[PDB]
Coordinates of N, CA, C and O and ligand atoms in Angstrom, one line a residue:
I1 N 0.7 -1.4 -0.2 CA 0.1 0.1 0.0 C 0.8 1.5 -0.1 O 1.6 1.6 1.0
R2 N 0.6 1.9 -0.8 CA 1.5 3.5 -1.1 C 0.1 4.7 -1.1 O -0.8 4.4 -1.4
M3 N 0.6 5.6 -0.5 CA -0.2 6.8 -0.3 C 0.3 8.2 -0.7 O 1.4 8.7 -0.4
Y4 N -0.1 9.1 -1.6 CA 0.7 10.2 -1.9 C -0.5 11.2 -2.4 O -1.4 11.0 -2.8
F5 N 0.0 12.3 -2.5 CA -1.1 13.8 -3.2 C -0.8 13.5 -4.4 O -0.1 13.4 -5.1
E6 N -2.3 13.8 -5.1 CA -2.4 13.7 -6.2 C -3.7 14.6 -7.0 O -4.7 14.0 -6.5
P7 N -3.6 15.9 -7.2 CA -2.6 16.9 -7.4 C -1.4 17.1 -6.4 O -2.1 16.9 -5.1
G8 N -0.4 17.1 -6.6 CA 0.7 17.2 -5.7 C 0.8 18.9 -5.8 O 1.7 19.5 -4.7
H9 N 0.6 19.5 -6.8 CA 0.7 21.0 -6.6 C -0.6 21.9 -6.8 O -1.6 21.2 -7.8
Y10 N -0.9 22.7 -6.2 CA -2.3 23.4 -6.2 C -2.0 25.0 -6.4 O -1.2 25.4 -5.7
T11 N -2.4 25.5 -7.7 CA -2.5 26.8 -7.8 C -3.9 27.5 -7.8 O -4.5 27.4 -8.6
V12 N -3.8 28.3 -6.5 CA -5.0 28.8 -6.2 C -5.3 30.3 -6.0 O -4.2 31.0 -5.7
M13 N -6.4 30.8 -6.1 CA -6.5 32.5 -6.1 C -6.7 33.0 -4.8 O -7.9 32.4 -3.8
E14 N -6.5 34.1 -4.4 CA -6.6 34.7 -3.2 C -8.2 34.5 -2.8 O -8.6 34.6 -1.5
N15 N -9.1 35.1 -3.9 CA -10.6 35.5 -3.4 C -11.3 33.9 -3.5 O -12.7 33.8 -3.5
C16 N -10.7 32.7 -4.1 CA -11.3 31.3 -4.1 C -12.2 30.7 -3.0 O -12.9 29.9 -3.2
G17 N -11.9 31.3 -2.0 CA -12.4 30.7 -1.0 C -12.0 29.4 -0.1 O -11.7 29.3 0.9
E18 N -12.1 28.6 -1.0 CA -11.9 26.9 -0.5 C -11.3 26.1 -1.8 O -12.0 26.1 -3.1
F19 N -10.5 25.3 -1.5 CA -10.1 24.3 -3.0 C -9.7 22.9 -2.1 O -9.5 22.7 -1.0
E20 N -10.0 22.2 -3.1 CA -10.2 20.4 -2.7 C -8.8 20.1 -2.7 O -8.2 20.4 -3.7
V21 N -8.4 19.1 -1.9 CA -7.0 18.4 -2.0 C -7.3 17.2 -2.0 O -8.5 16.5 -1.4
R22 N -6.6 16.5 -2.8 CA -6.8 14.9 -3.1 C -5.7 13.9 -2.8 O -4.5 14.3 -3.2
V23 N -5.6 12.9 -2.1 CA -4.8 11.7 -1.8 C -5.3 10.6 -2.4 O -6.4 10.4 -2.0
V24 N -4.6 9.7 -2.4 CA -4.9 8.8 -3.3 C -3.9 7.5 -2.9 O -3.2 7.8 -2.0
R25 N -4.6 6.1 -2.6 CA -4.1 5.1 -2.2 C -4.0 4.0 -3.4 O -5.1 3.8 -4.2
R26 N -3.0 3.2 -3.2 CA -2.5 2.2 -4.4 C -1.8 1.1 -3.7 O -1.5 1.1 -2.6
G27 N -2.1 0.3 -4.7 CA -1.8 -1.3 -3.9 C -2.8 -1.9 -3.4 O -4.1 -1.8 -4.0
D28 N -3.2 -2.8 -2.0 CA -4.0 -3.4 -1.7 C -5.2 -2.4 -1.3 O -4.8 -1.4 -0.7
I29 N -6.3 -2.5 -2.0 CA -7.5 -1.9 -1.4 C -8.5 -2.4 -0.5 O -9.4 -1.6 -0.5
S30 N -8.2 -3.5 -0.3 CA -9.1 -4.2 0.6 C -9.1 -4.1 2.2 O -10.0 -4.9 2.5
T31 N -8.3 -3.3 2.5 CA -8.4 -3.6 3.8 C -8.7 -1.6 4.4 O -8.4 -1.0 3.4
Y32 N -8.9 -1.6 5.5 CA -8.9 -0.2 6.2 C -7.5 0.4 6.2 O -6.7 -0.3 6.6
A33 N -7.6 1.5 5.5 CA -6.1 2.5 5.9 C -6.6 4.0 6.0 O -7.4 4.2 5.8
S34 N -5.4 4.6 6.8 CA -6.0 6.3 7.1 C -4.5 6.7 7.2 O -3.5 6.2 7.2
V35 N -4.5 8.0 6.9 CA -3.1 9.0 7.0 C -3.6 10.4 7.3 O -4.8 10.5 7.2
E36 N -2.8 10.7 8.3 CA -2.9 12.1 8.6 C -2.3 13.2 8.0 O -1.4 13.1 7.1
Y37 N -3.0 14.5 7.8 CA -2.4 15.5 6.9 C -2.3 16.6 8.0 O -3.3 16.9 8.8
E38 N -1.6 17.5 7.4 CA -1.7 18.8 8.2 C -1.1 19.6 7.5 O 0.0 19.7 6.8
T39 N -1.5 21.0 7.4 CA -1.0 22.3 6.7 C 0.0 22.5 7.4 O 0.3 22.3 8.8
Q40 N 1.2 23.3 6.5 CA 2.3 23.7 7.3 C 2.6 25.2 6.7 O 2.4 25.3 5.5
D41 N 3.0 26.0 7.2 CA 3.5 27.2 7.0 C 4.5 27.7 5.9 O 5.6 26.6 5.9
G42 N 4.5 28.4 4.9 CA 5.5 28.4 3.6 C 5.9 30.2 3.6 O 6.0 30.7 4.9
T43 N 5.9 30.6 2.7 CA 5.6 32.1 2.4 C 4.3 32.8 2.6 O 4.0 34.2 3.1
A44 N 3.2 31.7 2.8 CA 1.9 32.0 3.2 C 1.6 31.7 4.7 O 2.4 31.0 5.0
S45 N 0.9 32.3 5.6 CA 0.7 32.0 6.7 C -0.5 31.6 7.2 O -1.6 32.1 6.8
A46 N -0.5 30.5 8.3 CA -1.8 29.9 9.2 C -2.6 31.2 9.6 O -1.7 31.9 10.2
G47 N -4.1 31.4 9.3 CA -3.9 32.5 9.9 C -4.5 33.7 9.3 O -5.3 34.4 9.1
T48 N -3.5 34.0 8.4 CA -3.6 35.1 7.7 C -3.9 35.4 5.9 O -4.5 36.0 5.4
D49 N -3.2 33.8 5.5 CA -3.3 33.5 4.1 C -4.1 32.3 4.1 O -4.9 32.3 2.7
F50 N -4.3 31.3 5.0 CA -5.1 30.3 4.9 C -5.5 30.0 6.3 O -4.6 30.2 7.2
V51 N -6.2 29.0 6.3 CA -7.0 28.5 7.7 C -6.3 27.0 8.0 O -6.3 26.0 7.2
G52 N -5.4 27.1 9.2 CA -4.4 25.8 9.3 C -5.3 24.8 9.4 O -6.8 24.5 10.2
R53 N -5.2 23.5 9.0 CA -6.0 22.0 9.0 C -5.2 21.0 9.3 O -4.3 21.0 8.5
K54 N -5.6 20.4 10.3 CA -5.2 18.9 10.7 C -6.0 17.8 10.4 O -7.3 18.3 10.8
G55 N -5.8 16.9 10.1 CA -6.9 15.6 9.8 C -6.5 14.2 9.8 O -5.3 14.0 9.5
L56 N -7.5 13.5 9.7 CA -7.2 12.1 9.3 C -8.1 11.8 8.1 O -9.3 12.0 8.1
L57 N -7.4 11.2 7.3 CA -8.0 10.7 5.9 C -8.2 9.0 6.2 O -7.3 8.4 6.5
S58 N -9.5 8.6 6.1 CA -10.0 7.3 6.2 C -10.4 6.9 4.8 O -11.4 7.3 4.5
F59 N -9.4 5.9 4.4 CA -10.1 5.0 3.3 C -10.6 3.4 3.9 O -10.2 2.4 4.1
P60 N -11.9 3.4 3.8 CA -12.7 2.0 3.8 C -12.4 1.1 3.0 O -11.4 1.6 2.0
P61 N -12.1 -0.4 3.1 CA -12.0 -1.2 1.8 C -12.6 -0.6 0.7 O -14.1 -0.7 0.9
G62 N -12.2 -0.6 -0.2 CA -12.8 -0.4 -1.4 C -12.5 0.8 -2.1 O -12.9 1.1 -3.3
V63 N -12.2 1.9 -1.4 CA -11.8 3.0 -1.8 C -10.5 3.6 -1.8 O -9.6 3.0 -0.9
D64 N -10.1 4.4 -2.9 CA -8.4 4.2 -3.3 C -8.2 5.9 -3.3 O -7.4 6.4 -3.9
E65 N -9.5 6.8 -3.1 CA -8.7 8.4 -2.9 C -9.9 9.1 -1.9 O -10.9 8.5 -1.6
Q66 N -9.5 9.7 -1.4 CA -10.2 10.9 -0.4 C -9.7 12.3 -0.8 O -8.6 12.6 -1.0
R67 N -10.7 13.0 -0.7 CA -10.7 14.5 -1.0 C -10.9 15.3 0.2 O -11.8 14.9 1.1
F68 N -10.2 16.6 0.6 CA -10.5 17.3 1.8 C -10.3 18.8 1.1 O -9.6 18.9 0.4
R69 N -11.2 19.7 1.3 CA -11.1 21.3 1.2 C -10.2 22.0 2.2 O -10.4 21.6 3.5
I70 N -9.4 23.0 1.7 CA -8.8 23.8 2.7 C -9.2 25.2 2.4 O -9.3 25.5 1.2
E71 N -9.3 26.2 3.5 CA -9.9 27.5 3.4 C -8.5 28.4 3.1 O -7.8 28.5 3.7
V72 N -8.7 29.3 1.8 CA -7.8 31.0 1.9 C -8.6 31.4 2.1 O -9.9 32.1 2.1
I73 N -7.8 32.3 3.1 CA -8.1 33.8 3.5 C -8.2 34.9 2.3 O -6.8 35.3 2.1
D74 N -9.2 35.4 1.8 CA -9.2 36.7 1.2 C -8.7 38.2 2.0 O -8.9 37.9 3.0
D75 N -8.1 38.9 1.1 CA -8.1 40.4 1.9 C -7.8 41.4 0.9 O -8.2 41.1 -0.3
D76 N -8.0 42.7 1.5 CA -7.7 43.8 0.3 C -6.4 44.7 0.7 O -6.1 45.8 1.2
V77 N -5.2 43.9 0.4 CA -4.0 43.8 0.9 C -2.6 43.4 -0.2 O -3.0 42.1 -0.3
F78 N -2.2 43.8 -1.2 CA -1.2 43.5 -1.9 C -0.1 42.5 -1.6 O 0.8 42.9 -0.5
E79 N -0.2 41.5 -2.2 CA 1.0 40.4 -2.2 C 1.4 39.9 -3.3 O 0.8 40.1 -4.4
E80 N 2.6 39.2 -3.5 CA 3.2 38.5 -4.1 C 2.7 36.9 -4.1 O 2.5 36.6 -3.2
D81 N 3.0 35.9 -5.3 CA 3.2 34.5 -5.2 C 3.5 34.2 -3.6 O 4.9 34.5 -3.2
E82 N 2.8 33.4 -3.0 CA 3.1 32.6 -1.6 C 2.7 31.2 -1.7 O 1.7 31.1 -2.0
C83 N 3.4 30.6 -0.9 CA 3.4 28.9 -0.7 C 3.1 28.7 0.6 O 3.6 29.1 1.3
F84 N 2.2 27.5 0.8 CA 2.1 26.7 2.1 C 2.2 25.2 1.7 O 2.3 24.7 0.6
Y85 N 2.5 24.4 2.6 CA 2.6 23.1 2.2 C 1.7 22.2 3.1 O 1.6 22.5 4.1
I86 N 0.9 21.2 2.4 CA 0.3 20.2 3.5 C 1.0 18.9 3.4 O 1.4 18.2 2.3
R87 N 1.1 18.5 4.6 CA 2.1 17.3 4.6 C 1.5 16.0 4.9 O 0.5 16.3 5.8
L88 N 2.1 14.9 4.7 CA 1.3 13.6 5.1 C 2.1 13.0 6.2 O 3.3 12.9 5.9
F89 N 1.4 12.3 7.0 CA 2.2 11.5 8.0 C 1.3 10.6 9.0 O 0.0 10.4 8.8
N90 N 2.0 9.9 9.8 CA 1.2 8.6 10.3 C 0.2 7.8 9.5 O -0.9 7.6 9.8
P91 N 0.6 7.5 8.5 CA 0.2 6.2 7.7 C 0.0 5.0 8.7 O 0.9 4.6 9.1
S92 N -1.2 4.5 8.5 CA -1.7 3.1 9.3 C -0.7 2.0 8.9 O 0.2 1.9 7.7
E93 N -0.5 1.1 9.5 CA 0.2 -0.1 9.5 C 0.6 -0.6 8.0 O 2.0 -0.4 7.4
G94 N 0.0 -0.7 7.2 CA 0.6 -1.2 6.0 C 1.3 -0.3 5.1 O 1.5 -0.8 4.2
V95 N 0.8 0.9 5.2 CA 1.2 1.8 4.3 C 2.4 2.4 4.5 O 3.2 2.7 5.2
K96 N 3.1 2.8 3.1 CA 4.5 3.1 2.9 C 4.1 4.9 1.9 O 3.2 4.3 0.9
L97 N 4.1 6.0 2.3 CA 4.5 7.1 1.6 C 5.1 6.9 0.4 O 6.0 6.3 0.2
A98 N 4.5 7.7 -0.9 CA 5.2 7.8 -2.0 C 5.6 9.5 -2.5 O 4.8 10.3 -1.6
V99 N 6.1 9.9 -3.4 CA 6.1 11.1 -3.5 C 5.2 11.5 -4.5 O 4.6 10.4 -5.2
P100 N 4.5 12.3 -4.3 CA 4.6 13.6 -3.4 C 4.0 13.2 -2.1 O 2.7 13.0 -2.3
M101 N 4.2 13.4 -0.9 CA 3.9 13.1 0.3 C 4.0 14.3 1.0 O 3.5 14.5 2.3
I102 N 4.2 15.4 0.6 CA 4.0 16.8 0.9 C 3.3 17.7 -0.3 O 4.0 17.5 -1.2
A103 N 2.1 18.2 -0.1 CA 1.8 18.8 -1.4 C 2.3 20.2 -1.4 O 2.5 21.1 -0.3
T104 N 2.1 21.1 -2.5 CA 2.7 22.4 -2.4 C 1.4 23.3 -2.9 O 1.0 22.7 -4.0
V105 N 0.9 24.6 -2.5 CA -0.2 25.3 -2.5 C 0.3 26.8 -3.1 O 0.8 27.4 -2.2
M106 N 0.7 27.0 -4.3 CA 0.7 28.6 -4.2 C -0.6 29.5 -4.5 O -1.6 29.3 -5.4
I107 N -0.9 30.3 -3.7 CA -1.8 31.6 -3.7 C -1.3 32.5 -4.4 O -0.5 33.5 -4.3
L108 N -2.1 32.8 -5.5 CA -2.0 33.9 -6.9 C -2.7 35.0 -5.9 O -4.0 34.8 -5.7
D109 N -2.1 36.3 -5.7 CA -2.8 37.4 -5.3 C -3.7 38.2 -6.5 O -3.3 37.7 -7.8
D110 N -4.6 39.0 -6.3 CA -5.4 39.4 -7.0 C -5.5 41.1 -7.0 O -6.0 41.5 -8.1
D111 N -5.2 41.5 -5.4 CA -5.5 42.8 -5.2 C -4.5 43.9 -6.1 O -3.3 43.9 -6.0
Ligands
CA1 CA1 0.8 37.0 2.9
CA2 CA1 -2.5 36.2 1.0
CA3 CA1 -7.8 39.7 -2.4
CA4 CA1 -4.4 40.1 -0.5

């Protein structure tokens, strides 16, 4: 069992409100599996550019992907391109992560 981000890169608009992130499970599909994710600060900041999130992604037997939305924080203040990262971790017993196993998000400014 392998798990990774697909898409691994996300290009998002500051006005976009929310975007879906997607993690995929490959190999044996027949057993329950899970992986934890957590946003991580980059040149973009939790609290000011996006709202931080940590979670558990559960894959029941038979399901090979999980999606989750992340909220982008809009404002009226000019910036240039900025990144933050979502990272995977604590995969359940059978699981080994593959690349990408950290997703990259660029917030394109609009102001
Ligand atoms: Ca910023
Ligand atoms: Ca911003
Ligand atoms: Ca804006
Ligand atoms: Ca802005």
